[PDB]
Amino acid sequence: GLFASKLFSNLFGNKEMRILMVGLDGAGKTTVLYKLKLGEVITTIPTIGFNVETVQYKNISFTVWDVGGQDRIRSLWRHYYRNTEGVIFVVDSNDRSRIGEAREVMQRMLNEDELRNAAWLVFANKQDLPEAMSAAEITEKLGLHSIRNRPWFIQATCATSGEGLYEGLEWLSNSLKNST
Ligand SMILES: Nc1nc2c(ncn2[C@@H]2O[C@H](COP(=O)(O)OP(=O)(O)O)[C@@H](O)[C@H]2O)c(=O)[nH]1
């Protein structure tokens, strides 16, 4: 809220919020993870050979993990699923060949009745690349237009230069600050 003062904030919301990173592998969770600083460094395994990370920040929780068809599932992802209160989808702007893969994963994920009331956000990571897709083309490409209006928002960014990352969270914070 404050952090070295800087500027008087107004965020007073706290109606349960837990932002997790969902999407295709290599989308840019590694770069974004470091950006979040990583509150409580926790390393656990749901089953067989699945690597999941969990961190806690005061009240807001955060969890990162990849997803895909070839990927399996268990009962650990479900437990945290409902408990989760923040759904943020991040795809690769330079991986068009897999953009559909991200859409499908998002399609099945968004079909969770327990997540029907969760805030959904899309982030494009790799806008610094000269051959990277734009949020507009990405939005239409991933069928972002196919989803009802209000569910999620889309924004292009570059994980390397940090351009778009700050404005993306700041904006997201406002939406989370004003609850209907
Ligand atoms: N050009 C470019 N490369 C990026 C960007 N973000 C991440 N990368 C690189 O793309 C690869 C995948 O990033 P990563 O965050 O590890 O994806 P993850 O496997 O989903 O965590 C790494 O080599 C990153 O350095 C970006 O915005 N632009």
Q: Where do the domains of the chain lie, and which CATH numbers do they carry? A: 1-180 (3.40.50.300)
At 157 the three-state DSSP class reads strand
What are the CA-CA distances from residue 147 to residues 16, 144, 153 (Å)? 25, 6, 11
Task: Output phi, psi for 61, to 5 deg.
Answer: -100, 160
> Could you tell me the two tokens for 82?
């409902």
Q: Which atom of ligand 1 is nearest to the CA of 25?
A: 20
Strand partners, 88: 21, 121
> Could you tell me the two tokens for 146?
């196919």
> Could you tell me the two tokens for 114?
């327990």
Token look-up 């068809």 returns: 69
**Length of the chain, in residues:** 180
Task: Output phi, psi for 52, to 5 deg.
Answer: -130, 145
**DSSP states of 30-70:** HHHHHHH--SS-EEE-SSTT--EEEEEETTEEEEE----SS
> Could you tell me the two tokens for 88?
């943020």
Strand partners, 119: 86
CA gap 42, 61 in Å, rounded: 12
- 95 touches ligand 1 (CB under 6 Å): no
Rounded to 10 degrees, what is the CA torsion of 1, 31, 80, 108?
Answer: 120
Which amino acid is present at 137?
E
Q: Are 160 and 154 in contact (CB under 8 A)?
A: no
Method: NMR
Answer yes or no: 70 catalytic: yes
- 164 touches ligand 1 (CB under 6 Å): no
Buried b (16+ CB within 10 A) or exposed e, 147-177: beeeebbbbbbbbeeeebbeebbeebeeebe
Q: Are 90 and 123 in contact (CB under 8 A)?
A: yes
Strand partners, 54: 42, 63
Q: Which atom of ligand 1 is nearest to the CA of 32?
A: 15
Per 3-state DSSP, what percentage of the chain is helix, strand, and coil (rounded to 5)? 30, 20, 45
